[PDB]
Structures are given as structure tokens and as C-alpha cells.
Paper text:
The IL-17 family of cytokines and receptors have central roles in host defence against infection and development of inflammatory diseases. The IL-17 family of cystine-knot cytokines consists of six members: IL-17A–F, which exhibit differential binding specificities to five receptors, IL-17RA–E. The most well-studied IL-17 cytokines, IL-17A and IL-17F, are produced by T helper 17 (TH17) cells and are elevated in the context of inflammation. IL-17E (also known as IL-25) is a key regulator of type 2 immune responses and driver of inflammatory diseases, such as allergic asthma, and requires both IL-17 receptor A (IL-17RA) and IL-17RB to elicit functional responses. Thus, IL-17RA serves as an organizing hub mediating IL-17 family signalling at the membrane by acting either as a direct receptor for IL-17 ligands or as a co-receptor.
We co-expressed IL-25 and IL-17RB in Expi293F GnTI− cells, and they eluted as a stable complex over gel filtration. Two-dimensional classification of the particles in this sample revealed symmetric bi-lobed structures, consistent with a 2:2 homodimeric receptor complex. Site 2 (BSA = 636 Å2), near the bottom of the IL-17RB D1 domain, is composed of IL-17RB D1 β4, β5 and β7, and loops 6 and 8 and a composite interface made of the N terminus, 310 helix, β1, β2, β4 of one IL-25 chain and β3 and β4 of the other IL-25 chain. Key site 2 residue–residue interactions include F135 of IL-17RB β7 forming a pi-stacking interaction with Y106 of IL-25 β2 in the first chain, and Y94 at the tip of IL-17RB loop 6 burying into a groove formed by Y134 and N136-NAG on β3 of IL-25 in the second chain.
Residue numbers in the entry:
A (entry chain B), C (entry chain A): 74 to 144, 155 to 177
B (entry chain C), D (entry chain D): 19 to 57, 62 to 72, 78 to 112, 120 to 272
The structure:
């Protein structure tokens, strides 16, 4: 849960995220890497090392085109890969 | 004597590729309004005010809010309407917190390498923070109906004691105290009890917290870390 | 540039983005919407009405399967739509 | 006596759809390293350590930073090699500020309802912020070459004057003064002059600025708003 300087853009954002693996034996590509938000809350720009609770870590999603070798025969369905996290301001009721 | 029959089709229309020697005009006016059906469920209302050669009309709506969504509906015409002696339609399910860009064009439309595009209207769906749509399936499970009734008492300069009513949904809760900067941050765990349903949390604070703002964020598994929040203020208790 | 409370995430983010219209009479979808960062610098989580000079704004891009009506006939070429702005830390050397 | 030949192909392999009663094994080892070609160009070095029935192994390049990366090439063999008595490949460019995940699997591969996938290796490609990769075409315009010689002098408590060399690249400059919080903020426009290349900027400040860090931010049109900055410290000037 820290922000570095070189990057690229994954260790440089206020709410960083790490790339996790999802493997399948009939998908193109074989290896997909979703976005997983690591820091529960956004970090302070004063240091960039430690987190502050004033913000929220909310994922974003888009639909990616994948091909499935379902019994051979090919298949085309929309797939769900999280692209990146954003720091959104909270909702307060009352 | 025309009437409105409407359906669903998304993607390429058959007349989009084909050419047409003569082209209809265009929809002179177009309007959209939100109308709620009695029980909730919400459906979009599309009413436009409009020649002899004319076939149908297509409506496509796009939503862009933390997701991607795209739907289209074409409404056909039953028979020609020469008389001057204005239609409407109810055909789109509306989500929560979604901006909608809606545009319609007559079919057939302007041939390629020619001008005269259509016009569009815009509208933003009501959120979950209002009273009308606070009974939705998502909102209540996300915490719209829960009433924490926060009563936080400042014990002393360093410690603050917070009372809040619990719920069966969650067991761990955030805690924030913001006046100008962050002076209080803590994490707690509490088991839910039917006999006793009030919590007591002690949090250390740096600096004078008198008159601060108490912000309660629950850890409900169904809404992640971006869950709804409830207001609280430092109340001095004798 | 400012952050509102209802949403969605476009008027609620530290680096807000408004959607511009790119109308093409030979593209499917006929109307797309790129994200344009109205904030040159990131907003304070204290208010959200005013920005802070300690941050930077950067777009993210993706390849979205659109269709073009080139001479009619169908054809497939990726397009570079701007999804959202995210807040990224400065790079400082000397 | 096998030899290395490699082409390029992205998508589904002709053996991906087909099935095979007998399936070969897998690569014993695969190590990927970066190599530099003398003039610059940066290229990853792909080398795998490798039964009687076997044809080829595919190499793919995939990573993600602000973007995606996706390219795949094949690598045929010429003859079978029963002899017990190492292969390599140089065919892939390296981008700027991108992580890289390299994927390789023998052909043919395992059928459905089976095990034995391929492996992957990590790699972190440094950006152009290092002196070896400091003259690259893109960010050399973005300010790698420029030496500000930034010198900050404080006249009095309210104002600080900033002395630095101007460049023909930029005309409008923004500044940061950050020691504990933001105490200084201004925006100035200065035209570069061939006769005199040494400009003056006045930026008012709030509070005691002794010991602060003066930080410069140029609006060079090639780098937008994420341009490289240059560190400077306040110097008490007589
Ligand atoms: C309108 O006519 C087209 C022509 O085939 C047809 O495909 C479509 O289903 C019709 N619309 C409705 C609502 O039936
Ligand atoms: C959306 O509609 C509103 C209605 O006044 C208009 O002001 C705005 O320019 C429209 N925006 C787009 C992107 O169509
Ligand atoms: C908060 O809870 C504690 C639990 O022991 C209780 O003693 C205290 O009286 C409560 N606060 C108020 C204002 O009743
Ligand atoms: C590799 O072998 C395949 C299979 O015959 C062939 O189609 C392809 O052209 C070959 N590529 C090279 C570079 O030899
Ligand atoms: C990076 O290396 C570690 C161990 O060295 C491994 O566990 C991890 O899976 C690698 N990263 C990816 C994306 O595979
Ligand atoms: C900074 O620039 C101005 C420009 O005239 C000059 O007068 C001043 O002496 C410079 N600062 C120093 C320390 O020389």
C-alpha cells in the first residue's frame, strides 16, 4: 500500500492496485490480469507512503471481447475485466 | 389512423447499410420524462412531436456509470398519417446512478457523404439518496433504511466514546473524525446480539475534537468499502 | 471542475471528467463519449470545489470494438476512447 | 541439428482447434532478459530451455500500464533432435514505462478437461528516468536535457523571487512551494530571448518560507500536465 516514483502508473496513483492472475485452458488470451485495488483508502500526497481514510477505492469495469473454445467450436461472449481503480468522494445520507 | 407498437433490436439495422434515392424528413421535436409505475420499478417515457414516405423510428440509449451499457428500441408505424389532426412510448428500464444519452433518427436516414444529422436530449437518473427511490432492492440491502441513531459522547481530550445502534447485516465498522484534518481513525469488531443492540467504541484522538464531525462507514459485504455513510457530530455528554 | 454527491463517479471523483460528443454518421455506435479532464490538477478531499497543486491528472485508454461504414460495407477497427481521469503523483528529479 | 526460425502470428493457432491423441511435454525452463542493440533500441531476450513428436513453441508479449500490450509470434523447428547435447530469440521491442508478462507454450498443447498449462515470468521495464535510457526520443523533448540551475531567493516574508534559465520550448510556467503545506501558488508567462536567456519570476507566499522546497512545473505542450519537474531548495541570498 505505497506509491513509488518510476511507476508505471500502478505504483504512482493515490490508490494503487496490483494485477492478479486468472487462468483458463480454452481462452484467448491464456493469461488475463484483472485490476485489484490494494489500498483500502487513498494515500496522502504529502508522503505517498501511507493511507488516509478521506477517500474511497472504487473499481471500474469494462467489457472485453474474448473467444471460448466451447465443445471444436469457437464462442464469442462479453467478458468482465476490471481496468483500474479510481478515488471517488463518498456518499453521505442525512 | 396510426398507433404505437414498439420492440427491441440493438446493433445494425437493415436500412443503415442499404441506400435510398429519397429520404424522409426528421423528427421536429423530441422529449423525455421519467414516469414511475405503481407497485419499485422505473421505465423511461419517450414522447416526440413530428413525411408521406416514412417507415419507422429508432431510439438508442447509452448508459455510462462505473459500467458499460447499451440498448436500442425501434418503434414501427402502422399506416400513413396525412392528417394534421405526437406520440409516446414506455420502453427502457432505468438503473440507479446512470447518465443517459438518448437520440433518435428516422428510417431511412441521410445517405452517406451528406449532412443533416439528428438531435438528442439528455437526462440524469435519480440517485439512491432521495426518498422516492430509497426502497429499491439494492438500496435497502446497501443500508438506505437502516437508522444508526448515532449518539457520540466526548469522554475527554484524548478519547471519544461513540454509541450507535447495530444491525444484523454487519459486524465490523469504520470510524472517521474530520474537522479540518484527520484526527481519528480506528477499526472495530462487534458481534451482533439480540438482547443488546447498542455499541460502545473508544477511539484515541489527536487534538481538540470539540464540535467535530463523526462519520460512520459500515463494512457490509454486499456493498464493499464504498458503502453509504451517516452523519454524526460530537455531542458533549455530562 | 468540482465534485458533486449524487454521481455517478463523473461528478464525484477527485479528477472529474465530462463526456464530449463525437458524432459520426458512419460509425456504430453513432454517438460515443470521451472523458475530458476539466481539472488540470486534483481537487481537495476537504471540499472538492477547489483543486490542489500537489497532484496530476492522466487519462486511461482502451480499445473498444466499433464498426465503421466505409464503402456500403461493414468493417472492424479498434478505436481509442478515453475512459476516465485518475490522479497520479509527480515525478521530480534534478 | 535444429535451427531457430521464428515468424509472427496473433490469434488462434491452427493446432488450438484441432485435437491430438498424443501430447508432448513442456519446456523445462524459460528465462527472459533485456538486451540493448548498439546504435537506441531496447529488445527483450527470449530464451527457453527444452519429446520425439514436437513442432514449435509460441511466444507472446503482454503487459499493462496506462494501456495494454499484445503481440504473439511462432517459432518453428527444422528437424527432430534425439541428441542430448539451448535456444534463444530476439524479436520483440520494449516500450516506455510498461510492465511485461511473457507467455510461452509448446505446440500442440493439452486438450480440454486436462491439466498442464504454461508458465509466466515477471519483468519490470524501467522508464526514461535513468541515465542509460535518458536520451530517448520521446522524453528528451520533455525536459531530460534541460538543467534549470534553479535558484530561489527570498526578499522578505511575503514574497519569494525565483531565478531560473528559460527555454525556447516553454512560455508559461507554474510553480510549487511545498515544505509542510502549500504556501505558494502563482502562474507566469515568460518569452525566451536569445540575447538574454535568464528570466525573473515573482511568486507571493503565505508564512515563513525558510527551509522550504521550491518546485517548478512547466507546461510544455508535448507532455501535457504530467511533465517532469525539477527539484530546488530555498537559498538565503545576500
Ligand atoms: C418493424 O419491421 C421490421 C421489418 O422486418 C421488423 O423486423 C420489426 O420486428 C418490426 N417491429 C416490431 C416492433 O415488430
Ligand atoms: C445534453 O443535453 C443538454 C440539454 O440542454 C445539453 O445542454 C448538452 O449539451 C447535451 N450534451 C450532450 C453531450 O449531448
Ligand atoms: C454508550 O454505550 C455504553 C456501553 O457501556 C454506555 O455505558 C453509555 O451510557 C452509552 N452512551 C450513552 C450516551 O448512553
Ligand atoms: C511455421 O510453420 C507453420 C506451419 O506450417 C507455417 O504456416 C508458418 O509459415 C511457419 N513460419 C515460419 C516463420 O517458418
Ligand atoms: C512474479 O513472481 C512471483 C514469484 O517470483 C510469482 O509468484 C508471481 O506469480 C509473478 N507474477 C505474475 C504476474 O505471475
Ligand atoms: C534573479 O533575476 C533578476 C532579474 O533581473 C535579477 O535582478 C536578480 O539578481 C536574480 N537573482 C539573483 C540572486 O541574482
Amino acid at each position: 500500500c505505497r506509491a513509488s516514483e518510476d511507476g508505471p502508473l500502478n505504483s504512482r496513483a493515490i490508490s494503487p492496485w496490483r494485477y492478479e492472475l486468472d487462468r483458463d485452458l480454452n481462452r484467448l488470451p491464456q493469461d488475463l490480469y484483472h485490476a485489484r485495488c490494494l489500498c483500502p483508502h487513498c494515500v496522502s500526497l504529502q508522503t505517498g507512503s501511507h493511507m488516509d481514510p478521506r477517500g474511497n477505492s472504487e473499481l471500474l469495469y469494462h467489457n472485453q471481447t474474448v473467444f471460448y473454445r466451447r465443445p471444436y467450436c469457437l464462442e464469442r461472449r462479453l467478458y468482465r475485466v476490471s481496468l483500474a481503480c479510481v478515488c471517488v468522494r463518498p456518499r453521505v445520507m442525512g | 389512423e396510426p398507433t404505437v407498437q414498439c420492440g427491441s433490436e440493438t446493433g445494425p439495422s437493415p436500412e443503415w447499410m442499404l441506400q435510398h434515392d429519397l429520404i424522409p424528413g426528421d423528427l421536429r421535436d423530441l422529449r423525455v420524462e421519467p414516469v414511475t409505475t405503481s407497485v419499485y420499478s422505473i421505465l423511461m417515457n419517450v414522447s416526440w412531436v413530428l413525411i408521406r414516405l416514412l417507415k419507422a423510428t429508432k431510439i438508442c440509449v447509452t448508459g455510462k456509470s462505473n459500467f458499460q451499457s447499451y440498448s436500442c428500441v425501434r418503434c414501427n408505424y402502422t399506416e400513413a398519417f396525412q392528417t394534421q389532426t405526437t406520440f409516446s412510448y414506455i420502453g427502457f428500464p432505468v438503473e440507479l446512478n446512470t447518465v443517459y444519452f438518448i437520440g433518435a433518427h428516422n428510417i431511412p436516414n441521410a445517405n452517406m457523404n451528406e449532412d443533416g444529422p439528428s438531435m438528442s436530449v439528455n437526462f440524469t437518473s435519480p440517485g439512491c439518496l432521495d426518498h422516492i427511490m430509497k426502497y429499491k432492492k439494492k438500496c435497502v440491502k446497501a443500508g438506505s433504511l437502516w437508522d444508526p441513531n448515532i449518539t457520540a459522547c466526548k469522554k475527554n481530550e484524548e478519547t471519544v466514546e461513540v454509541n450507535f445502534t447495530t444491525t444484523p447485516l454487519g459486524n465490523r465498522y469504520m470510524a472517521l473524525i474530520q474537522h479540518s484534518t484527520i484526527i481519528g481513525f480506528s477499526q472495530v469488531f462487534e458481534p451482533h446480539q439480540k438482547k443488546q443492540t447498542r455499541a460502545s467504541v473508544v477511539i484515541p484522538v489527536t487534538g481538540d475534537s470539540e464540535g467535530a464531525t463523526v462519520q460512520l462507514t459500515p463494512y457490509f459485504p454486499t456493498c464493499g468499502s464504498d458503502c453509504i455513510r451517516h452523519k454524526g457530530t460530537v455531542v458533549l455528554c455530562p
